[PDB]
Amino acid sequence: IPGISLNEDNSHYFYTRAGRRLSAEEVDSWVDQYAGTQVKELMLCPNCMRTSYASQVWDPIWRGYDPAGPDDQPLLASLPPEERVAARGWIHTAWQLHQDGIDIYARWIRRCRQRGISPWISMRMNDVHYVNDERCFLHSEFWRENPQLRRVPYRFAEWTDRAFDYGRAEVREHHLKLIRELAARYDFDGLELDWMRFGFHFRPGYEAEGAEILTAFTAEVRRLLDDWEKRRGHKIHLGARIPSRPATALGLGMDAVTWARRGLVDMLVITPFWASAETDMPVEIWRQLLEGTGVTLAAGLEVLLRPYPDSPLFQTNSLETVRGAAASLLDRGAQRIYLFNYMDSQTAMEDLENYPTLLREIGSLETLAGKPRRHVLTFADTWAPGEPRAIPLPATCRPGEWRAFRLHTGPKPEPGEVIAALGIEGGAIGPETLEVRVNGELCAFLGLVDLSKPRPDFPVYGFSVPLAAMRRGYNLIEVTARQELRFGWAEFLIRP
Amino acid sequence: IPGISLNEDNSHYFYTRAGRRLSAEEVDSWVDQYAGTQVKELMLCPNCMRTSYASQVWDPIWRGYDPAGPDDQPLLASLPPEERVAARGWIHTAWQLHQDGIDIYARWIRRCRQRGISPWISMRMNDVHYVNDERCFLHSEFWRENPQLRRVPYRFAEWTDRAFDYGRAEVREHHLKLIRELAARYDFDGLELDWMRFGFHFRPGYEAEGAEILTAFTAEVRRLLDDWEKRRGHKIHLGARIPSRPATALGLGMDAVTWARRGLVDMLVITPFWASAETDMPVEIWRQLLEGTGVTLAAGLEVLLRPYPDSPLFQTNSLETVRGAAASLLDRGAQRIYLFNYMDSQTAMEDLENYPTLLREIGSLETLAGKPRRHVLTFADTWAPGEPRAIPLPATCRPGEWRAFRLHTGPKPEPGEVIAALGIEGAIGPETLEVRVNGELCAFLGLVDLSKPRPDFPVYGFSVPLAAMRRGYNLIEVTARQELRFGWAEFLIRP
Ligand SMILES: CC(=O)N[C@H]1[C@H]([C@H](O)[C@H](O)CO)O[C@](O)(C(=O)O)C[C@@H]1O
Ligand SMILES: CC(=O)N[C@H]1[C@H]([C@H](O)[C@H](O)CO)O[C@](O)(C(=O)O)C[C@@H]1O
């Protein structure tokens, strides 16, 4: 009954369908694959710094575009030859659609309602893809002409250094112009403010004033949609994506508790940025913080699954690891599982054959129950500027020392197998090199485990967990080593 | 005004007054130094594994004691000769009080009320000092005879490994026996459950069931005190010390939000363990979590001030650093500043001459305003088992890389001087660092000669444009032209 919110990005559909002259019927058929699943809402993203539809107030993706021209034309000149082919796939498909009088978002919204899906618009509030390239096709002329409106002018270390400063009147107006058009153009059930693209909206040190500013912004949005409710003849929801921990959220100027209490939002998505999906997010704390407000709390998953920030592995979640994350987060009180970057091609799970099963299982503890799952230890990629960072992995154990790892494994396991699995980096061990306990109970050595993707590129050792040791929620791996060891991976595999 | 809660520990008074035959009058005079200050409550701790008063349900500190005997006697045999002198100071003074018919806690409670101080009892729920020594004088016989009731039987790496497991009925009963006695023996305004001595109460991995167990415990205590309200003819408060961050609190089986919502507690003290004061605690998050519950949220200071867990420096807070922490935590919404280990001698601020001034200033932003203060970067000493730890220092900056440190400096500074000061561990010039605060370039000042507490490595000062500083967090950003390791960071605000 919690169900899935699925986010469709502003570029994917155009990139993957490029080269086809799309009919209204084919455009509609994209919604259909999500019909009869646990998907309750599609969050349709129509923009980055530019829109993928023919905006009157912002730059469409195709502003500057020469449809008949060569790839080497001014709009694409800044990219290498090979990347112009991909960018032009997006620009051209978005352009051609408009030329045929097909508004892709209007069609998706209409088809959503026919298929019992609640259609949302999700706006990227501060996308900064490729801002190292000032000439790049997908920057707004407004961004290009106004470097004084940026967040960090004293350095350029990260893309977010060149993000818009929402402390400025003219930055808020620029984003409110697009919202006023989206509300007028599209008859959506809900608007989501996607603050987590890229989650950095304020001069470093100005986040507290930023918090009062985004609350007022959110209130302007809520007021505007209230007017549209009387016009459309139905309720319109307002939602937001925010960081995964309340202190990080408040530290980036997102006081979601105030937004909830003053009735500005009725859905909140707690999410990482992109580096890895968080398999561990303090859902129960947010639920306490949001008590009485009537806000739907969604737990946001990302497609990547990576053990630590500096890992060179860039593999996606599998059905089994999404089953783990989803079982965990629903067990903690998530009222929705929200998928970001889990699309039907290119930006999607590596085991794409499992996409339909995933959409029919991860939205309920009932449909996850008795199915194989993996609870993998990862990390929170997003922290407020100068906020101390708590990153579990990698973890050194010196001879005779103890290390502990708490992994959230949601519902108590049904009868069957539980393996605590630990990856060791740097080249190794015997059957008595490690002592492994779970909630204090000794775990028997199993030997090397042949993991399916996602998996580390170093040996993973399995330890058999006495079924009855496992408890609902967090479960504690403790390890001591007789030799210095570095851990690069931890998970629970539960196969009932 | 928010005001001060001050904790007197179970041993201090006995250790420091040892060798004097104490009169009822002198015992009473201890309360007097706190009268007419911002202290609203004295939290009088009467126990560890043993009581400092003559309990009939627990071991007094002097169980086993031979008053006329030599230092080398069975009760103290396990200590080296010179440590028996200190321990025996505590045991003998506590014993001799009882022999004179002086109940120190009954006298303190009475004298508190005469002097307009609200008197509390603060019970250590699981003290584990010196549990490496199974024959130690301060361990209870119950603890000694029941090693099966301990938290960790598979290893002994930390004192908390030999803490009692409150997952056991026998452990809960044992601690409830003392609470039943304290409620009957003493007419206190409030009982505080000091969970933060030592904050580890459950088998590793059983903290969730632990949370339901301490809620039921706390509720049992609340029901007990409700009965005593009708006998004593006045309200009795129930309070608790808990970890500084909500996730850590819930992770150690302390669901204080439930305790607050069900009206089991009406005071909560967020605090670190002992390694250092936390100058940065999520007060505003707790206030949101506690909204409508009527619970007073107290921000707990510890006496030590240390930049990171492995630092060999063990210096205390000064008047100036306590002013900084207090200005910060009050600014964030603390309804009380709570002092732990800020006593009148031995366990005390090293600038002891400033103790009376401290007790008249740190309870109100009004009395802190326009006074010199230091906002020092530290760390949270306490994390749930296997919980990822966020420790800011020490911090390496590679050539051409940026590091940031957010320090909470509470109220925006008055007219005067603001210095960002950065300590370098393990050779720099005036351009080796670029330092910004909230993006504004800060002038190199050179080496700053800090007063204690201070690192044993060079501290460089950077002049902050007064107007850059904001209310609450303020952001130091630094880039280095040479590989450097920071061991220290602070704001000095001198109006
Ligand atoms: C690289 C690619 O093809 N698509 C990517 C898009 C585009 O970069 C973006 O939509 C341009 O506006 O961004 C994401 O959705 C994102 O932000 O997480 C990830 C996705 O993989
Ligand atoms: C002289 C001395 O060491 N006293 C210390 C006492 C005793 O060790 C304890 O009361 C034994 O029961 O403990 C503390 O208050 C504590 O827990 O932080 C600190 C204080 O410095």
Author numbering:
A (entry chain B): 6 to 432, 434 to 502
B (entry chain A): 6 to 431, 434 to 502
Authors' account:
The catalytic domain (residues 6–376) comprises a complete (β/α)8-barrel fold while the C-terminal domain (residues 377–502) consists of an eight-stranded β-sandwich. Here we show that GH156 sialidases define a distinct paradigm for sialidase action with His and Asp acting as Brønsted acid and base, respectively, in an inverting mechanism that is unique amongst all exo-sialidases described to date.
It is possible to identify the characteristic triad of residues coordinating the carboxylate group, although it consists of two arginine side-chains (Arg129 and Arg202) and one asparagine (Asn346), instead of the three arginines displayed in conventional sialidases. Asp14 is ideally placed to assume the role of general base, through its position on the “beta” face and its direct interaction with the product OH in the Neu5Ac complex. When overlaying this structure with that of EnvSia156Neu5Ac it is possible to speculate that a similar process occurs, with the carboxylate held in a pseudo-equatorial orientation by Arg129, Arg202, and Asn346, and the aglycone fitting into the pocket formed by Trp164, Phe203, Phe278, and Trp279, forcing the glycosidic bond into a pseudo-axial orientation.
